[PDB]
Amino acid sequence: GKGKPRGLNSARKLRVHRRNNRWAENNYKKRLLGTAFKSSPFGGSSHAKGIVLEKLGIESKQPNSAIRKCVRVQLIKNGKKVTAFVPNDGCLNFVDENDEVLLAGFGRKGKAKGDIPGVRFKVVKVSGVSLLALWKEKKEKPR
């Protein structure tokens, strides 16, 4: 008879059994304990904040290669160094040194011809203004 009780008074058993097994689930346990965001890429947040340490690939030759677009920033709520993209070597110029960049996830959908893997972050705001804003010449980077 399918393993579970079925009698019209057995609701206490059906309910209590469900509670224990619901705990045995995994998304559920994490949701109630508060750990999904300890799994998340960089903590709770959706953007993180970092300091530009050094620009990698300054000396590479072919322009607009991934190792040109990359930089290296240390996340400030950990003191933890991670590398990050930046479109447009021009924008590589817009970001220089000790700049307080605002990083976001990369969320790439498909690989490219020479994309560096294992580089999951992209720079969004630099010293408080938008990289696309600077690049489009709407704004100007305030020192």
């Binding site: 705990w23 689930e25 346990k29 304990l33 508060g34 965001f37 709770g44 947040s45 953007h47």
Partner: protein, 49 residues
């Protein structure tokens, strides 16, 4: 030649239940009363920090 099939013996630790109770306190008990609200407030608070 002979093909002597082997047999598995028994499990060691693959249980969500014992994994919950394996730390001293009952991680099941020390929980909250509104998981969705926790989620969105932790979101918002982490961003503000």
């Amino acid at each position: 030649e002979q093909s002597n099939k082997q047999h598995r013996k028994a499990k060691e630790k693959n249980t969500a239940k014992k994994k919950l109770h394996t730390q001293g306190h009952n991680a099941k008990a020390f929980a909250v009363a509104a998981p969705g609200k926790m989620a969105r407030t932790m979101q918002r608070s982490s961003d503000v920090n």
